[PDB]
Amino acid sequence: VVDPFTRKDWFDIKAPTTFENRNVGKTLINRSTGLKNAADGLKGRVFEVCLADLQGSEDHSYRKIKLRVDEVQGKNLLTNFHGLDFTSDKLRSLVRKWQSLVEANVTVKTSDDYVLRVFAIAFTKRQPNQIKKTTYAQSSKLREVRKKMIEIMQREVSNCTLAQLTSKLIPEVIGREIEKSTQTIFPLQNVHIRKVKLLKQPKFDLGSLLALHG
Amino acid sequence: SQVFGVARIFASFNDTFVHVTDLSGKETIARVTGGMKVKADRDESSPYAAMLAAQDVAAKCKEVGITAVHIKLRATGGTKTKTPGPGGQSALRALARSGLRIGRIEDVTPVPSXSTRRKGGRRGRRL
Amino acid sequence: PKKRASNGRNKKGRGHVKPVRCLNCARCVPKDKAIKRVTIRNMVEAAAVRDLSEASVYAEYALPKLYNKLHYCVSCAIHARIVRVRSRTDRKIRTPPQ
Amino acid sequence: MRDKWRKKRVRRLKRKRRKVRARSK
Amino acid sequence: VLVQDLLHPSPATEAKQHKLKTLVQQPRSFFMDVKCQGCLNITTVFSHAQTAVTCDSCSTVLCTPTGGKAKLTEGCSFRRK
Amino acid sequence: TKRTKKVGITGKFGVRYGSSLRRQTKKLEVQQHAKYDCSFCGKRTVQRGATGIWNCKSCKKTVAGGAYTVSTAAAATVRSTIRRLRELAEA
Amino acid sequence: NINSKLALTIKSGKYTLGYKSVVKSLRTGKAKLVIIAANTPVLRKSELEYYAMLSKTPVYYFQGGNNELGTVCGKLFRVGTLSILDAGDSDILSSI
Amino acid sequence: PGRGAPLAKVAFRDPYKYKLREETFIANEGVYTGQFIYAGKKASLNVGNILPLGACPEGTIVSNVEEKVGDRGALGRTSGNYVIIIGHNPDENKTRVKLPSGAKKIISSDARGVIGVVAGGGRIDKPLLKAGRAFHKYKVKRNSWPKTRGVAM
RNA sequence: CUUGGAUUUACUGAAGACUAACUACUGCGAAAGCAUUUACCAAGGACGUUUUCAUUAAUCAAGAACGAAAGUUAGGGGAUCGAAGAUGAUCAGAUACCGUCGUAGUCUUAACCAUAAACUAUGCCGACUAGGGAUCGGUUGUUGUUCUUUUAUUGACGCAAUCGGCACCUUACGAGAAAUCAAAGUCUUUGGGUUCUGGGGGGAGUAUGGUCGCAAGGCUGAAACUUAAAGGAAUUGACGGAAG
Numbered sequence A: 001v002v003d004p005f006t007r008k009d010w011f012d013i014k015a016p017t018t019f020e021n022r023n024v025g026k027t028l029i030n031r032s033t034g035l036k037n038a039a040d041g042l043k044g045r046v047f048e049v050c051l052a053d054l055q056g057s058e059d060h061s062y063r064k065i066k067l068r069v070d071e072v073q074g075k076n077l078l079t080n081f082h083g084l085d086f087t088s089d090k091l092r093s094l095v096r097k098w099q100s101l102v103e104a105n106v107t108v109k110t111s112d113d114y115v116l117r118v119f120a121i122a123f124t125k126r127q128p129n130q131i132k133k134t135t136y137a138q139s140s141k142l143r144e145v146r147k148k149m150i151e152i153m154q155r156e157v158s159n160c161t162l163a164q165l166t167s168k169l170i171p172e173v174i175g176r177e178i179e180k181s182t183q184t185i186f187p188l189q190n191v192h193i194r195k196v197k198l199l200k201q202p203k204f205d206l207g208s209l210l211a212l213h214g
Numbered sequence B: 001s002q003v004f005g006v007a008r009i010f011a012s013f014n015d016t017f018v019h020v021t022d023l024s025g026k027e028t029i030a031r032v033t034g035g036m037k038v039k040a041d042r043d044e045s046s047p048y049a050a051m052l053a054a055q056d057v058a059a060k061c062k063e064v065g066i067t068a069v070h071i072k073l074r075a076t077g078g079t080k081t082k083t084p085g086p087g088g089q090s091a092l093r094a095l096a097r098s099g100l101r102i103g104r105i106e107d108v109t110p111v112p113s114x115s116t117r118r119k120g121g122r123r124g125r126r127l
Numbered sequence C: 001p002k003k004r005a006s007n008g009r010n011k012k013g014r015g016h017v018k019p020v021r022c023l024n025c026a027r028c029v030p031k032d033k034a035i036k037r038v039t040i041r042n043m044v045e046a047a048a049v050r051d052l053s054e055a056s057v058y059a060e061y062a063l064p065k066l067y068n069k070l071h072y073c074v075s076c077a078i079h080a081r082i083v084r085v086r087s088r089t090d091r092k093i094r095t096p097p098q
Numbered sequence D: 001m002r003d004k005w006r007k008k009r010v011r012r013l014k015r016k017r018r019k020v021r022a023r024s025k
Numbered sequence E: 001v002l003v004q005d006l007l008h009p010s011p012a013t014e015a016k017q018h019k020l021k022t023l024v025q026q027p028r029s030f031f032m033d034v035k036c037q038g039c040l041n042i043t044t045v046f047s048h049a050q051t052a053v054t055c056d057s058c059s060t061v062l063c064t065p066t067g068g069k070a071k072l073t074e075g076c077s078f079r080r081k
Numbered sequence F: 001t002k003r004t005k006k007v008g009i010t011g012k013f014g015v016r017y018g019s020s021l022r023r024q025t026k027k028l029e030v031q032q033h034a035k036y037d038c039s040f041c042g043k044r045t046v047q048r049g050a051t052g053i054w055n056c057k058s059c060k061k062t063v064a065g066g067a068y069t070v071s072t073a074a075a076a077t078v079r080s081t082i083r084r085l086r087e088l089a090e091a
Numbered sequence G: 001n002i003n004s005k006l007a008l009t010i011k012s013g014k015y016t017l018g019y020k021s022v023v024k025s026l027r028t029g030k031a032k033l034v035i036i037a038a039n040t041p042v043l044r045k046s047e048l049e050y051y052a053m054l055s056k057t058p059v060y061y062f063q064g065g066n067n068e069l070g071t072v073c074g075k076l077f078r079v080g081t082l083s084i085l086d087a088g089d090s091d092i093l094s095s096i
Numbered sequence H: 001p002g003r004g005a006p007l008a009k010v011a012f013r014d015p016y017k018y019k020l021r022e023e024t025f026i027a028n029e030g031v032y033t034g035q036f037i038y039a040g041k042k043a044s045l046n047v048g049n050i051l052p053l054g055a056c057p058e059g060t061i062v063s064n065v066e067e068k069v070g071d072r073g074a075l076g077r078t079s080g081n082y083v084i085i086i087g088h089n090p091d092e093n094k095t096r097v098k099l100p101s102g103a104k105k106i107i108s109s110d111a112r113g114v115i116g117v118v119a120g121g122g123r124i125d126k127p128l129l130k131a132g133r134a135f136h137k138y139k140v141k142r143n144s145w146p147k148t149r150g151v152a153m
Numbered sequence I: 001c002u003u004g005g006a007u008u009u010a011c012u013g014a015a016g017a018c019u020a021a022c023u024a025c026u027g028c029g030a031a032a033g034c035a036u037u038u039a040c041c042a043a044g045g046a047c048g049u050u051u052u053c054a055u056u057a058a059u060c061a062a063g064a065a066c067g068a069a070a071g072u073u074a075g076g077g078g079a080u081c082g083a084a085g086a087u088g089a090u091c092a093g094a095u096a097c098c099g100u101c102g103u104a105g106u107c108u109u110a111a112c113c114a115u116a117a118a119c120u121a122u123g124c125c126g127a128c129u130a131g132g133g134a135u136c137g138g139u140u141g142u143u144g145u146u147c148u149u150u151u152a153u154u155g156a157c158g159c160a161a162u163c164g165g166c167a168c169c170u171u172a173c174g175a176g177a178a179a180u181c182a183a184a185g186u187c188u189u190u191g192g193g194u195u196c197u198g199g200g201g202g203g204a205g206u207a208u209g210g211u212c213g214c215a216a217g218g219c220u221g222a223a224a225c226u227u228a229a230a231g232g233a234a235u236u237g238a239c240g241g242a243a244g
Ligand SMILES: O[C@H](c1cc(C(F)(F)F)nc2c(C(F)(F)F)cccc12)[C@@H]1CCCCN1
Pocket: F077, F078, F079, F080, F081, F082, F085, H045, H057, H058, H059, H060, H061, H062, H115, H116
């Protein structure tokens, strides 16, 4: 009778420049009218898109990125980094019996007042010549690993902006820094930054958003 | 290129939901349930009802402009079962064979990191 | 008589073990006594693998697996044939079957 | 009677004797 | 074994034993002359020392206690007394 | 000798008002009339004047407090927070 | 550790206890260390450390109250302040 | 008399003439005679200090809080009570608080409160026990006691 | 419950609980019990020790501390499940099982209560008696190993010894009515120390007196009378809305 889909307009999502492939996709919303503009009814939407589709490599298939629109230019939506998470399957495939799991998180503010919660995860590594069934670290070793995780996450997020942090998240620089820093404690494997959570945004600077789009 | 939506399939043991949105999920494209395709409550979760619902969803997506869908599959989750209901697979297959193109697939079942008390009491459901 | 030297659970050297809820009936069963099965399954039935390969916009997309750990009480475990009643000498066998 | 429910019966029986005789201390 | 010499255990077996379970209990600790590269004198240190032992004018710490044997510091040799 | 078994200070009320009300009274009336250590001079000479007013006979300082004890639990948590809220700020 | 060092001074050193005695030991310059309890009034505390500056005497701020300082010195009475005149066979003076 | 909470007499210098100003405050628990009290926008977060609600972080306990800016105190004034700061809305210059009754309210961030809990808390935990205690209670409040039941008339 | 938009979907917020996966024939504690991070506080076993004291010890009527869950009192909290209650089914009837709600309760702070198949249904201390591979903690000697860093006093792993612990497998000399047992052995070839408990089945953990408790109850605790078995472990059969 009505077809609400007759009154819809389509818009193009755009990723920031920190990612390779920027044409994320398309969304739709009612046409802008006298009462409600489409822009403000559309600013603030969040899109979850796989990192593999953003970069063009299946090596990033297990991470997915949240992109939040905060400016509309004609038919383009300018989105910014809104968070990182693992797919459920990858996280389940990592967690396994006969080995220790060690986890840490920290709340840290970027160089440009972006407040984040960062979650690191790691598992004890089995040595090539090992004969014993289990690979457990004593609780003190896990505590020291956790301390290293937190202080490196602190250092690497505090001394950079949200865009530089987005650039750092892609090649797992923090993960490799954790792996290197904890070799002398206990061999570790699958050291990941498994989740990044955006707790606070600062005052919106439109000019800095445009700097990251084209 | 393709225009992607997100097919959000909620397959419980009582029903199956074939629900396509846009990428944000804030706009519904089509929503059809297994219970729309049968006249009996007992087979609202049947694979055949799920496949019928998936075809009708696929037709609606075709006429709207959706040409492909990513897959978000969930069980009931929470304190309830984590195993997907029987219609989820048939709905997934019908979507893939309907002409829509397929993107990523993920399981999004709600999983507690421990939780509230599940119903049924200490001695369980006594059948 | 005493049927099992382990009392039908796995608690030696501790007092109390917290319960878990049976998947089937939601009965409270001690975690050491619960019958537990680790399952890793293909998310798509092996029949629809080719349909979903044909319909994929990607080429060489690795299909995700389903991971789940299942907990049963004794009643539901026996009822659904996760375990079976064994003979008196066979009960002692603890290695997994083949 | 499932020995447990016999004790509960004596509990109730003994509870009522506590009230009959309290009429007289 | 039904016939065995309990008065003369073979020295290898007797050496594998706990210190309190030989025919006559005996310590496995010892005293050692330790030289430090800075000085030329010698100090007498217990093998399982519990004290971070100092010395004369070159009062550099010579050992640090652990759960068992004392860990000799970087650049100190020892000779068993 | 032990003059009463359980009434203690509420023995001034005799047999009246009910045992539960007298027992509830005893808890707070004991705390009401007790001597508390002064946090200023360190002597156990703090006594109640009226509800919420606690005076030290020795150093003559008065502090606001609870109705029947010098300090209430809600007040203590507030103090613990503030003195914590600056230690972590300096670090 | 500080309490044990001070405790050994009391057993084998020379000291005087109490505010009036401390002020005298500062005027005669016989004081080697002044210790002030945490609940000492700020007025008396700032007077004592003004005397200690005139006589070039170090000041230690004991973290317990006058009740706890008196116990640390082996006394059954409160001590609001004391001065060490001779450290005895202790390294209290070199360790503050 | 008539009040469960003690009062604090606090002296201030007059900024504009050579003269001493005395103020009557509701005493929070822990305030002592001789203590220095700080009131203003830049005042530190200490028990007994008077601060704008916008200057207090979330979770702060505060009493004698102003409903409107400058009314000199309306909320959380009786013994043992207080007001909790719930959240801030800096763009609107509004603060959200929780009242003793459980109600939640939005107040201007320029309204003031006194850090801490009102002293004298716990009065009602002890039974009055006697008609005479109630008589002495209302002897300094108003003529509201004893009460004749309506059905007895 | 839903065209007054249910269910479903995305974003955001608020509350109480709880601490998944990792998680084990693994750890700790007197037992009850104990599982997110960090900091602080005081304890602890084991190990190491050519340190110290020198019999200070074992077990214990009386007497004390702690003691799951439920339950009690007073404040606070009350998401979720949920005794009572309400209600839909089923049924010959079900005030039951199953469905939907839901009070107390579930949580916390001050006090109580003192009980569980509180179980290893197995008192505590001490000595001795047989083979085996694993594992947790400490210590001691030693690499075809991975890694700092190229190497030490990196770390992980690997190989041996040892003390302590949670256990397990085989045997059966021995024990036992047997089931089974590394103690439940060293017991008619009957004696290392010591505490507690039982004496056919019921009546009955009842009555009464005492005592503790706010109460619910806990502890102590008979007799009249009644009765030929009750009971344990195993065997063959039969039966099973058990399995193959
Ligand atoms: O929001 C909380 C909070 C509580 C309390 C208390 F309940 F004790 F009164 N007071 C707080 C205060 C206080 F009022 F200044 F004491 C400030 C900020 C936070 C407070 C927490 C307490 C731990 C530190 C972070 N704020």
